[PDB]
Structure 1
Amino acid sequence: GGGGSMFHVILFQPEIPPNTGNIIRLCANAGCSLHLIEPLGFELDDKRLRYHEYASVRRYPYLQSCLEALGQPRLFAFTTKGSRAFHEVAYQRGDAFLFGPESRGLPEDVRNALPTDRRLRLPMREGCRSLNLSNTVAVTVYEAWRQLGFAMGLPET
C-alpha cells in the first residue's frame, strides 16, 4: 500500500523532471515505491507529466535516510561501472534498486559501499550513448518483475 510494494526504486539526485514523471508512471504500473535523494534538479509540482499517481513518492536528504526508512532492504546499484550483468541476479520482493543521476555517475563512495556482485550493469554496446534513465529503470524493474511472474497483488497491503 505504502511501502509493502514489490520493489523500491531509488533515484540519486535526479535532474530532469520528465524522466521522474515517467518513472512515477512506471512504478504505478509495476506496483513499486519511488524514492528520491535530494538535491533534485526540479521541484515536484512542475510539468505534471500526465489523481494520486504520484503521492507514493518520497524524498529524502540522504541515501542513508531513505534506506533506514525502508528497513535496510537488499540493495543493488545500476551503473555503467557495474561488475556484473543485471540479468544474472535472482531478484526477490522488497529489493531496492539505486540509480544515478542523468548527467553524472553515482558517486564512487555510494557504489563501493555495495558488494561487488551488487554493482550491476545493463548490456551496453561499445561506443554508444547512455540510455535514458527512465528506460533503464523500466528495463531493470521489468526484468526483476518477470522473475516474479509479473505477480500483481499478494500482498497489496
Structure 2
Amino acid sequence: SHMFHVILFQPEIPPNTGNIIRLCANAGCSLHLIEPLGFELDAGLDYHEYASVRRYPYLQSCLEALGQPRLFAFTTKGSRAFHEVAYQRGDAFLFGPESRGLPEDVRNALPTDRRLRLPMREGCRSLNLSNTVAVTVYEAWRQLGFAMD
C-alpha cells in the first residue's frame, strides 16, 4: 500500500522518470505513466524500485485502476499554491510532460481548487520535472509527519 500516487502524463525525458522512480521509492509513492512515453522503459536504480512502475494507455485507465483517488494537477496555469492543500493518504498527483504540460481538457476536468502551482518567480525558467515532483511529494509527506506506514 502506498501513501501517495504519482502520475506522469506522457513523460518525455528518461532521466527525469529515473529520478522520479528513486523519489517514489524513498517516499513510499506508487508511480504511474500515461502513454505514449517519449522513451522506452529500458542508470543507478535497483529492482524493488524499477519493477513496480506501471504504464497505462490513457489517464482514465490509470484512475480506474487506482479507484478514482482524490486527484491534484500541478500546472503553472493553476489557481492555487500547492502548499495551501491539506494532503492525505491515497492522494494522487498528476504532472504534465516536460515540453508541453497537461492538455486543457485534462486540467479542466478537475475543480479549480485542485489545479495547483508551485511558487514561481516571474521571468524565470520552469523547474525541472523531477524537482517539481520531489518538492510536491515532500510537502505532502511533511504534512503527514514523514510517516513510513
TM bracket (short chain):
over 0.9
Offset from partner CA, 1:70-96 (integer Å, 9 cap, x none)? 000000000010000000000000000
Distance apart, 1:111 and its partner CA: 0.1
* Partner Cα separation in structure 2 for residue 20 and residue 112 of structure 1: 25
Match of 1:122 among 112, 115, 118: 118
Offset from partner CA, 1:13-52 (integer Å, 9 cap, x none)? 00000000000000000000000000000011x3565733
**Contact 1:82/1:119, CA 8 A, preserved across alignment:** yes
Percent identity over the alignment? 98
User: How many pairs does the alignment contain?
Assistant: 146
* Partner Cα separation in structure 2 for residue 79 and residue 51 of structure 1: 31
Q: In structure 2, do the counterparts of structure 1 residues 50 and 16 end up closer, same or farther at CA, with 3 Å as the change threshold?
A: farther
* Partner Cα separation in structure 1 for residue 34 and residue 123 of structure 2: 30
For the residue of structure 1 that corresponds to 2:47, the secondary structure is coil
For the residue of structure 2 that corresponds to 1:11, the secondary structure is strand
In the alignment, structure 2 segments of 5+ residues that lack a partner are none
For the residue of structure 1 that corresponds to 2:48, the secondary structure is coil
TM-score (norm 1): 0.91
Q: In structure 2, do the counterparts of structure 1 residues 53 and 119 end up closer, same or farther at CA, with 3 Å as the change threshold?
A: same
In the alignment, which residue of structure 2 is the partner of 1:67?
A: 63
Distance apart, 1:56 and its partner CA: 1.2
Offset from partner CA, 1:97-151 (integer Å, 9 cap, x none)? 0000000120000000000000000001100000000000000000000000000
Q: 1:30 aligned to 2:4?
A: no
* Partner Cα separation in structure 2 for residue 85 and residue 121 of structure 1: 5
Distance apart, 1:53 and its partner CA: 1.6
